[PDB]
Amino acid sequence: VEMLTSDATIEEFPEAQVSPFFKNIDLQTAKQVGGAQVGVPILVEFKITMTSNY
Amino acid sequence: TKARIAELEKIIGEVKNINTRKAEVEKKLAVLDALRKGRSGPVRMMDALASATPKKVWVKTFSENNNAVSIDGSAVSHDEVAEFMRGLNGVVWTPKGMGRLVDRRRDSKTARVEMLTSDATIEEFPEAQVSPFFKNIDLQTAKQVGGAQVGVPILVEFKITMTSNY
Amino acid sequence: CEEPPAPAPPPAKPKAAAAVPVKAAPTETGAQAAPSYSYVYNPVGKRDPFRSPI
Amino acid sequence: LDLELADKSEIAQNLNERRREMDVLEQKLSEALTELPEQRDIEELLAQINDIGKKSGLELSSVTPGKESVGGGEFFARIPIKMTVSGNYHEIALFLQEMANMRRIVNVNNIKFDSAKLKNEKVVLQSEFQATTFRFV
């Protein structure tokens, strides 16, 4: 779904953390899609990439 | 007059009866929140079935190489991990060597818990010391994992690497 | 004017004094905390692991 | 009569402010708070955080206020402050313990820190501590 930024290969430094099991790289993108007169979604489409643990 | 003045002596009698009890609930409970941390303290991160536990608290992974031990653990707060780190050593580490085990950690190819920073090869200068037997290189990382609505751990996940003596 | 105070009464203070007092409270109250402190911590302990693995 | 009517509104308001925080102080098994006195001075909290940071030797790389937690209490809006300081482990333990010994309502909670040097050629720990004070609603 090419609303999305691309990619999946990099090197990561932790800023903040809540799951000890997951290394999210970043919220790669996010765009609030409104819709039209035919219908809504209105919400925030997004994309994330994340390496877990082991 | 004499009616509502009485009303007000009573309402202020309340407000004072009030204000002095707050400063004691206040402090009793600050104590109570130290103590709940004093009962979480002796307890956890990582479930096991052991009669006696060799460490003060439980931890996660332990992997050695007959020169250094790269460990993986968790502690109750900025305190028990400070107690644990003080019990070992403290070091100014400098020229680090990168080696194929680091990338096997980035690869996930050697099983561990990738909250952790990597590495296990460097050169160490002592800052402070408590065990004459152990050269801790540094608290490689530490992150307080909160949990979710399905459950807690709330504690501070951490990682350390340490070469002993002999 | 009003005098050393006013007349007999002294007077008028149904106005001064009535749209004053104040309301006092006076709030003999909201000062400084000792707070309070919690207590630490429960272990006896053991060995297991970690005896065999070191 | 008219001054006493002043005292009645004053003390009724002080009663409301009791209910406000005495009943919050009687709160139960869940989350538990620290004591809440009316601190009501924020900029001095930021300033004193900067000072304890400086005397601990830490570089304060970022202080970021929060949003008030509109559903974090019926009688108090919690404002969280996320602080971001770098230095030695001893110095960040120090910074934390000084903020936990302050005379203001900066309840430090969820802590984190990590090694800020990519290549890891010198010791350095970036630290991000979360600490909040509890304004009224």
Next chain:
Amino acid sequence: IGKKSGLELSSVTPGKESVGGGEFFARIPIKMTVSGNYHEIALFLQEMANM
């Protein structure tokens, strides 16, 4: 006493008061970090112990 002993005072770091280090006293620890010669640090120590 650091300066007259010839030492470079690379860091002085106060502590936290030891809330459970006494019923009648809060102990404040101060960690001092000075560099020089063995004779000079022995000196610095003995002067602080004679203060």
